[PDB]
């Protein structure tokens, strides 16, 4: 699992019908590193720091085993700078 | 036990007042042989003529119409498991 | 005495009911009357905890056959200082 | 002439609430104080006067407006309430 | 328009309400004094008129707004209020 | 145009679908949205006679399957004078 | 934007995880929660089509299982302009 | 107090909500911003503070009211609160 | 036998003298 | 208010329960408390008639289930001059 | 002692009133305020305290005398009693 903060919201409207409603967010290890997508399974504002897991464990803390997800936020760090 | 199981009892007054646990000694509680502050010595006092729901609660199972469809093609997100979205004239979102 | 006792009942009736009966019953102040919405009225009486416990449970048994009767009745017997924001002081 | 007496009575709207506060009135001696809209649809009308006058009207008032609408809940007399619940009490109608 | 009979109709929603003071209205030489809104749904419209006036309004009133909506709760006519009840009794809309 | 339609609804949404469906479908004015109480909501619209039609067709179509639904649509071609104070005339 | 998105839900805790999560979703601008009366609250937002699509529907998942529940998730992309006159324009 | 994690329950009628205000406040550190009559009977309590102590409190809350009169109707918890959100929550009682 | 709004609304009005 | 009403028990405990329902159950003024002999004790209320009538009513039926129990409840709507001699006051 | 409450006790004979006045004042934090021969036998005792204490001074006092001599004939609380009845209630035991 990584540490990243939520920099903002990301929109595709026409993604595919099986990411169902989650929402999606732009995210990055710091300001300047490369920035990724995540599913937002927790409900995150930006600029918290948050935890991150990829691989197969990404789909089912999105929400199914076949949920096609390879990053999910899945948890707020209380205190992190 | 020393307190009723929760299931099983309700309190008469909740809070400070509940009666589920039983405490032994010198407890405010009163038994049969006392009268008095309760009872029939305050619902006894002022006559009363008994007589004989719109929300949003009492509508949780009101009848609808047949769930709208969605027969689009394309790329548009189109998911038809999650909750029921609506767009202009009622149109499956 | 600053114990809090409630009744909460459908109609207004029964909570005036329960309130005279409390205020009679035992060595209590009144100290509101709110009218919750939907029918619910709730109504507060403050004092020792052994006087509110016993106006609470002669204002229950009073109101319980009035009207459309009673739906709570409960005692805090000590009264978080946050939650006294929320409470009317006089009626 | 008001007096020490309360007498009530709640229904379920307004017509049975204003039926019940006419009888009230007509039939004995009594001062209409209140109309509240409780909430969810209940009416309440309060009288006050001297006992047998708030007797009176409240028996009225109960047998005018049972058929009237939704009808009536609850139609109740306090001889003398206690002066706490004076101030929960509206010394005329709104 | 004179008289002092009072006619009254309460409908559970608005749009009865507004049906029966439109009947009211046309059928018989009646003011519209009020409407109110009671809570929880109910809906009462007022008429004042003379008391052979407020017979044939409120009947009207009464027929038109039965089947609309969710439809009528009461109809009721008083030929004289005490002036007691004035005070409870809106005088304009 | 002085003919009036209405539609009523359980809940705001529905309400505002029913507006919004009515003033595209004809020439109508909105005049007026009145929450009821007790979760009615009611939407009111000014016109002619036929676009008065076209519309309350058109918003009850539209908005009976959004929320709780819809509850009346009606139509009073000719508004009595005396009515016209109890209708609002901007929203 | 000018598009509006709606939720409508039983009691105000749904409401307001609904509200939450819309605008943690998209970009879109909280302008009102109405206490309808009975129990029903609704809240409003405001902004550009896909992102007010984007923001209703993850507010309609977040809201379903919480209290009593949803009642309505509405989409509007193109609102009229009468209809302007009855939507709040800020909340309050 | 500070912490911007928010807090809620939600109860039918006044009574469980001032329980559950009483226990949420009397477990953790939490402010107790606003009580809301939400309309139909609905009552909410909302309190702010640190994700631990928010999470403390309203499992206290939501244990403490569920017996209390008509009973509990959400216990929810926020971690992080949108800033558009913080516009219709109250900042005091 | 006379029409008009009297025939209108039958057991529905309850203020009438007939219903007192 | 110059009606009276009286209430009689067997008993002390009785007659309290009594004097205190009707006091406050309407606006009457209790005027005394007498020990009849043979355990007979009789509590007095004044007022006007309508509110000693609900008074009585209201020690009536607060004292039958107290101890040994009720014997009499009584009203008199005006009381005679030569009648308050016996009768005590305050 | 500060007490609004009033407790009662009454028996047949003067035997189990006194066992019902030591087993109220032991159990409970109570003044006894009155002894009264009240006339035919029957003895009332009178306590005055907290609500609490009161109640749990009455159930004590009637557990204890209701196999004592010739019994137990009442045992009543009441947790205010009006301002009027106050000038009937002894203040000292004489
Ligand atoms: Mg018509």
């Known amino acids: 699992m990584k540490i990243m903060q939520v920099e903002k919201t990301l929109v595709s409207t026409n993604r595919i019908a099986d990411m169902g409603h989650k929402p999606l967010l732009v995210v990055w290890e710091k300001p300047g590193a490369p920035r990724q997508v995540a599913v937002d399974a927790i409900g995150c504002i930006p600029g918290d720091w948050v935890l991150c897991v990829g691989s197969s464990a990404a789909r089912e803390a999105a929400g199914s085993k076949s949920y096609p997800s390879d990053l999910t936020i899945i948890g707020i760090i209380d205190q992190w700078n | 036990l020393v307190c009723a199981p929760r299931s099983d009892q309700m309190d008469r007054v909740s809070g400070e007042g509940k009666e589920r646990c039983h405490i032994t000694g010198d407890d405010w509680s009163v038994n049969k042989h006392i009268t008095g502050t309760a009872g029939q010595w305050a619902s006894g006092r002022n006559p009363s003529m008994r007589g004989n729901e719109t929300s949003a609660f009492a509508n949780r199972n009101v009848p609808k119409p047949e769930k709208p469809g969605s027969k689009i093609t394309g790329s548009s997100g189109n998911d038809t498991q999650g909750s029921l979205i609506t767009y202009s004239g009622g149109a499956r979102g | ?91």
Not at chain 3, 45 to 69: F, I, K, M, P
Not at chain 3, 73 to 82: D, L
């Open chain 3, 1 to 91: 005495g600053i114990a809090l006792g409630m009744i909460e009942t459908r109609g207004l009736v029964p909570a005036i009911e329960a309130a005279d009966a409390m205020t009679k019953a035992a060595e209590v102040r009144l100290v509101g009357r709110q009218f919750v919405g939907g029918g619910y009225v709730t109504v507060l009486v403050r004092g020792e905890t052994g006087a509110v416990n016993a106006a609470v449970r002669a204002g229950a048994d009073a109101c319980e056959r009035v009207g459309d009767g009673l739906v709570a009745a409960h005692i805090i017997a000590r009264v978080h200082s946050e939650v006294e924001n929320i409470l009317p002081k006089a009626p």
